[PDB]
Amino acid sequence: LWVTVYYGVPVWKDAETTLFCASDAKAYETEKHNVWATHACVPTDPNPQEIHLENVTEEFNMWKNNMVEQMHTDIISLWDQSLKPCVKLTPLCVTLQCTNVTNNITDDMRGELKNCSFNMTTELRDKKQKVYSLFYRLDVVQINSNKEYRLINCNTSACTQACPKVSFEPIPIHYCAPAGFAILKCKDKKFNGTGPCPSVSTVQCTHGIKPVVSTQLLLNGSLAEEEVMIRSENITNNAKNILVQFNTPVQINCTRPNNNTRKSIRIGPGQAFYATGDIIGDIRQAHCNVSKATWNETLGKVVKQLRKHFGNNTIIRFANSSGGDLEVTTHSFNCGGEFFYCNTSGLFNSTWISNNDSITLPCRIKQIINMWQRIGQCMYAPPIQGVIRCVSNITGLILTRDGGSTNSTTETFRPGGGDMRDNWRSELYKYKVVKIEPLGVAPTRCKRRVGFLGAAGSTMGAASMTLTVQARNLLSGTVWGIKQLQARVLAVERYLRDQQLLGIWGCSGKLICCTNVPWNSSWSNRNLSEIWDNMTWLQWDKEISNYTQIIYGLLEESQNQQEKNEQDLLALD
Amino acid sequence: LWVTVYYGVPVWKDAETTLFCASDAKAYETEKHNVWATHACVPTDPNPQEIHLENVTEEFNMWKNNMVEQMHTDIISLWDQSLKPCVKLTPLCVTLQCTNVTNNITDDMRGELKNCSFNMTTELRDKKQKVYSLFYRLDVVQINSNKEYRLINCNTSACTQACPKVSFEPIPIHYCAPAGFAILKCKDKKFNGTGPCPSVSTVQCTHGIKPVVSTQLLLNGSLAEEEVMIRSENITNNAKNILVQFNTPVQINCTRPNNNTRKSIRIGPGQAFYATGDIIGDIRQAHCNVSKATWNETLGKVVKQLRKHFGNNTIIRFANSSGGDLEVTTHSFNCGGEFFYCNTSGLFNSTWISNNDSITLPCRIKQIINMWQRIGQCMYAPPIQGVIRCVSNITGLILTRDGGSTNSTTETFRPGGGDMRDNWRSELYKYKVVKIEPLGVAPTRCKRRVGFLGAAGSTMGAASMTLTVQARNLLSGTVWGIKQLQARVLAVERYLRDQQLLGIWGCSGKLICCTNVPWNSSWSNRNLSEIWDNMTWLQWDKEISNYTQIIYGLLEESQNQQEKNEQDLLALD
Amino acid sequence: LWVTVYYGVPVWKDAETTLFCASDAKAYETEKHNVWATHACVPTDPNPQEIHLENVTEEFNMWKNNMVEQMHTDIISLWDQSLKPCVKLTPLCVTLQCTNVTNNITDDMRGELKNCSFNMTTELRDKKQKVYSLFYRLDVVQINSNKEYRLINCNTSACTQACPKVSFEPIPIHYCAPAGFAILKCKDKKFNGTGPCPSVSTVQCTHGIKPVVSTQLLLNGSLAEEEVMIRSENITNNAKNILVQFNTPVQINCTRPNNNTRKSIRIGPGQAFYATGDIIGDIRQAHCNVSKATWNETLGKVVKQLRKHFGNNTIIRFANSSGGDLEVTTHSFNCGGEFFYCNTSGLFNSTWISNNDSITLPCRIKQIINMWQRIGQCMYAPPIQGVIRCVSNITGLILTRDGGSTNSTTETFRPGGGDMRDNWRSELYKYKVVKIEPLGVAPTRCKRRVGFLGAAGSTMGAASMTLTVQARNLLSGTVWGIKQLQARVLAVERYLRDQQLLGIWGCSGKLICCTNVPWNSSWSNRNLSEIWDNMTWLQWDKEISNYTQIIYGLLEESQNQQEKNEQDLLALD
């Protein structure tokens, strides 16, 4: 009959907000190399809390998530911030004099290293300096008695050498939302990227996400749980990348067996340039090894789950990439500072039908890079002395279907990728951000006299006793610097708005503040047995969400003001 | 009689604060390249509300407004931000060797364009490049086989090319104040600039203001109603500009018949310099057209209002600009990218005794500009390819009077301008920012036991029923980015201070409350019928403004502390 | 028996927070623009409030004061900010060719002023310029038939010319604590800098302190009272400085008799380089003067007050500095823009046994400078034309004890300094920041039915009637603005946390409230009369902070939740 206002109901709606980084601050409390990304984040909770929701079935969507875009923008801005402070190599674009290096009489790499020598400025503007350095063939381009060259990007973009002190080591970060927002987590083991997730769990924020950069194979990412899953925006469409994820890792070992040496040239006053001085001992190519039997078994599995969608009689035949830029055409990870670019033509060999030492990947290195498909600004990665070795493990792939015929007697899958959002979407697949609103109104028989969300799936009557748990922690009282400020300002304003709305009414209280506005039959007149015993809060929100504004207006104006002026006139005499 | 505290009365008072931007969704969603000003402006509400205050009369002042200065600072800051991130053109200073253009036939514009050639640097620091470009006569100065010149600014300032993609296209901007403030709006049809406006209305924020930059003639402005209103700070003083506002607009057309060509010179790495390569076909001077009959009629209408201020039978005479810099001597503006500088001696030339064709304005174009009289921050607008044409309205003038004696036989009005504040002040003449304060105290016979401003003109008895409406909107739950954040924080702060000051008294959760403070007769006591039925809250607060601190001190000391301590002593048994 | 929560109670504890500047408007209104970026600082309070606290004893310490480090960081940041828009002199690193003092007659100083002639780029790229300048012997280092030199730091740092408009003139800076905090001012006459101060006071803003710079002598410092004070972290440790603060000042006059003239050389466009053109008249030595009798008397006082720690009849000896950099070896300072560097060996040249016109100190001047022992950043102070004279007051030394022994026979003292924290620490020795904690709990017999800090020393019974004054003040109503914004948001967040924590309990009504938690005897049981009337509020915080968290837990969980769970039954009707 009479309206009653409830504060702290289990209700949420989809929204987007400014997330802030959290990371393990104890590891870097003792200072180390100034990492590219992870600094100034709030310390992470030593005991993260994950709460399971009893009966809810939330709808997820991988390919229209906003956290991926926020992550990509954050990484781009962090990289741009990192590159700015240190040296600019504007005076290095000069005509070079380059000849082939003479290794320690070992062949098959003779044409790849140059010994460019050139003129460079010095401290005093009136004088010039004569220097030399070693450049890779992919870094230096010809300009048309030994022939003379220039750097590759002199006619496109400038160069800012990376600050030698920082380190491009990926290390995990946690994206945490402001107070008043919650991040759901799809939990079932067969989530194909879209559709309902019958198992859901609320977490304050995420686990450790390593911002690894790669094009053709995903490295160090999170594995699947039950089986190797295949995800795509629309599998039937050939234009959409077919992300894949493994359940057991395939180990890849990469090396640069050259005893490189750094050599600093001054281009001062103050500024210095680090050249590739000289290589000691033999010179050999950089190669990556992947176990043959393990890779064969992994592909023989992926083809098995891949035939679930494309029929169980078709012929599946992998192949190397079609072509394009060197980033797209070759697996382009980074290992300790050097930016490899490796072939992968030996991996994607097979032709499957219904019925042992290693695989070597010969490859090459480039020092100058302009990643994220950008133009107008490049970077010069300084050389790293000594042999460098990495042991990653392949966790997923990025496939693309040819779709070259309509009969569909066979299918051909060439690996691709290069849009860095695909790497992030492979990790943020089981998250979304929701906006908790704690206020609610429902009819009852009042007349006023003169887990964190574990009750979400329960009926409205069952959830009418746990109101306090929602409202207890509603406030929870340079990149990563302004984001925290905006996040906490938004949280404070949300708490203040909720308190003001609950205060202008007659309630000023937490649990079950009865009111006096009569229940109009126009606001979905149902039997109270059909309301309290049948429905739940999330369902109760939807049909009445049109009329919440009218009920708020009636409570604030029609009832409280008249009631209080009546009390004031009562105390007159 | 005892004091009673009301929260959310219609009281306001004049104040100055920080405003933020807001733009239309159409301009917000324009996929093309960003406009010079609006990038992070929040989208505007599709339906702003007008809450005409009914019986209120407020004192307006056009000249001493603070919105104008804030707009000027914001515009200058936006320009400086716009020019920072693209090409700097320091190495263009070279001794240029120039020669006249050959024209086509029947030479008429010989001395304006020069065919300058100079040696310019290329990407490779070793080599040099021979190029040529066409510079207008106003952009070069001779130095002492053919003659040689330098650029205009290479002994005062360093050039900086305007970014080639961004366009200085004026578009509407709305300046909206944060929560807890209001922007009143005068609507008197004959508002001359100062004095009380008997018809006052409040909007959430202003109408669309086009930030057009021009001098000597206001373009694309807002027109008056029923009269050709004329405004000035002081008509007797001859050192003050006399703004005008036409009833109906005057159509002005402008053209640049030369068919330019954009020649790209690469002076990298990365940078570039766009040059006026060569002109195709016939070559002629830029000119602007204004209808003769319309302009004659408009002058004949404006002189009638000048006769009112300066008396009947006085002869009003017009004359062209007094002389000085080219910025103020000629009607300067930009039409699609080219900065025109048009002679206006054909318009301001007439004499008016007591009792079909088109006018052609010769015009000249300049490329190197240092607008806003800020020497040291020059700019080089790149050439715009193809014929340029635009059609605009003239909706105002900026006249100045001649002060040679008075002996009022006649007056001589000469156009002026140059200070850009007058362009903004012509649009923001019907607004001012007033901060709303909700708290208030008034007497009555009660003692305690032991539209958004539509009621601003109503009596205190009727106004006390609308405390909810006033009290609701006190939170409303790059340069613009920090403006919005600071304004939001300020609003939250003011609301929290109001809440705390209400809470130290015994009236925390209530809009109205009775208190046991006696009403001292020294506070201008009056019969209740003369307060609650013969006064309004704005008029009441104007009377008790001296005793507010004493009453607040009494309420916080004599009542709450003593009451709580005595109640604590009572609860012991 | 029962617990009762008190809000707004005079209790504080040590804490650190970012402070904000406050300077008078006259400094900005001075014609010398941007002397210290006064626009950043807030206008000063016209009447700072000092409230005497009558019974409080507080533990002071200056050797761990955080305000010293905050002032140092603020000064460094302001200095770096000031020079950013100024000219950069990278093209000045040229092979100079210098030949002593050929243009003038000089006394026996001989080769201190080098007459340097060298090439330079004119306002145009094409043509070079032949110019000259006078550089001091300290500003040029030889490089290997007239000899040739270069500037001192052409292989270390890039000079940036000081802007000529601004001047490095110190002005008062007032430090004001943000909302919620307070600054305690110790007023004891004989305060050593450590231990309990029995005459504490409080101030909203500190007294005006001038950020002077000088190594071996403190200039314009604040004077002590009634005796020369000696302060040290541990006097018997040889490695720690021993500050001194004279009772009465010793005046020092300094002069630059050379009559310099400024020559403006153009490095255009938009850049100028001010050289030392020529010296009119005879070359003469720069020197400083100190009164002999006054200085001898001051050292006679310092020995009297410094033998107190060491011995009544121990030999104490003074001596000049040992060696090292010119900054530490010699008393440096600025005198009207010229950075003097004067040896003080004519002053510390005394020996004192167990039981006549003026001291003159000739000294040098250096132009290129980089204070704080910084590397990578430098400045070139332009010449100050005309004869220069200064007058200053010495107000404290910075001594240092030698580690040799002679365990008791003799003690040797030398001037020290070099780190600029000591100069700030000599002025902020009587101020520390404290954080106010307004919540408090005390036992009493109440059971619930089913100046700003002048009372900090008074008993709890009397201090319960002044809860309003503390509670009222807690809220207190581009680059470098985010610091103030973050401090402000932090204050708001702290207030909201306190209010929410009070709201979880059954005490939404502010100030003295009562709760039903019994008072366990284990929590420092005392008879009630000796709790309320034989003890103060600060001492109560020193005997509950162990159990305060558990008391808050009992209040928030054990009583209010059960009360609501009992109330829900009666809420149905």
Ligand SMILES: *[C@@H]1O[C@H](CO)[C@@H](O[C@@H]2O[C@H](CO)[C@@H](O[C@@H]3O[C@H](CO)[C@@H](O)[C@H](O)[C@@H]3O)[C@H](O)[C@H]2NC(C)=O)[C@H](O)[C@H]1NC(C)=O
């Ligand atoms: C006053 O407002 C008028 C709006 O009518 C301004 O004229 C407009 O100027 C723009 C920019 O030149 C014109 O758009 C351009 O059109 C050309 C094609 O001619 C196109 O190639 C460009 O990319 C751009 O879209 C626009 O057509 C023109 N308006 C009209 C009706 O022609 C005028 O510039 C304003 N006054 C001042 C002083 O800015």
Ligand SMILES: *[C@@H]1O[C@H](CO)[C@@H](O[C@@H]2O[C@H](CO)[C@@H](O)[C@H](O)[C@H]2NC(C)=O)[C@H](O)[C@H]1NC(C)=O
């Ligand atoms: C997924 O992509 C496929 C493209 O193959 C879409 O299927 C096409 O739909 C159009 C429109 O009806 C037909 O003309 C084509 O013949 C279809 N192609 C095939 C191979 O069947 C499909 O609609 C897309 N799915 C979604 C949900 O967008």
Ligand SMILES: *[C@@H]1O[C@H](CO)[C@@H](O[C@@H]2O[C@H](CO)[C@@H](O)[C@H](O)[C@H]2NC(C)=O)[C@H](O)[C@H]1NC(C)=O
């Ligand atoms: C990729 O696959 C092709 C065939 O699919 C491989 O070519 C085979 O090489 C072996 C070894 O000489 C021959 O015995 C076969 O006859 C070849 N097959 C065909 C169809 O000609 C090729 O070597 C593979 N390359 C890599 C790098 O894995």
Ligand SMILES: *[C@@H]1O[C@H](CO)[C@@H](O[C@@H]2O[C@H](CO)[C@@H](O)[C@H](O)[C@H]2NC(C)=O)[C@H](O)[C@H]1NC(C)=O
């Ligand atoms: C200044 O004199 C005081 C004694 O009056 C010394 O301070 C004492 O220091 C000890 C050591 O920490 C403390 O336990 C005492 O409480 C302090 N008492 C007082 C009154 O401050 C201090 O050491 C002297 N300073 C110097 C530099 O010698």
Ligand SMILES: *[C@@H]1O[C@H](CO)[C@@H](O[C@@H]2O[C@H](CO)[C@@H](O)[C@H](O)[C@H]2NC(C)=O)[C@H](O)[C@H]1NC(C)=O
């Ligand atoms: C102050 O400094 C002195 C000297 O540095 C310290 O005294 C020394 O203490 C060690 C440890 O017992 C002895 O081995 C030395 O012989 C002492 N030297 C002298 C000269 O006394 C003293 O401990 C320091 N005091 C404080 C409070 O730090």
Ligand SMILES: *[C@@H]1O[C@H](CO)[C@@H](O[C@@H]2O[C@H](CO)[C@@H](O)[C@H](O)[C@H]2NC(C)=O)[C@H](O)[C@H]1NC(C)=O
């Ligand atoms: C610093 O200079 C001042 C003058 O500007 C000196 O003060 C003067 O000294 C002379 C000689 O003793 C007196 O005749 C004047 O009356 C003094 N003038 C004033 C205003 O006091 C001062 O002695 C100099 N100090 C030093 C250390 O040389």
Ligand SMILES: *[C@@H]1O[C@H](CO)[C@@H](O[C@@H]2O[C@H](CO)[C@@H](O)[C@H](O)[C@H]2NC(C)=O)[C@H](O)[C@H]1NC(C)=O
């Ligand atoms: C400051 O003055 C003293 C005293 O004149 C200078 O000390 C000289 O030191 C050198 C090296 O031992 C010797 O010439 C003498 O011992 C001292 N000179 C005289 C005349 O006795 C000191 O060099 C001066 N400071 C500077 C930076 O030169």
Ligand SMILES: *[C@@H]1O[C@H](CO)[C@@H](O)[C@H](O)[C@H]1NC(C)=O
């Ligand atoms: C505008 O009108 C007011 C009267 O309301 C008058 O005081 C003022 O001088 C007028 N100003 C002008 C410029 O006409």
Ligand SMILES: *[C@@H]1O[C@H](CO)[C@@H](O)[C@H](O)[C@H]1NC(C)=O
């Ligand atoms: C007293 O109140 C009456 C209301 O009926 C009013 O008419 C009268 O003017 C008042 N007199 C004074 C002195 O305020």
Ligand SMILES: *[C@@H]1O[C@H](CO)[C@@H](O)[C@H](O)[C@H]1NC(C)=O
């Ligand atoms: C400059 O003066 C110094 C000091 O007397 C002297 O050693 C030097 O030889 C002089 N320079 C020349 C060029 O004579």
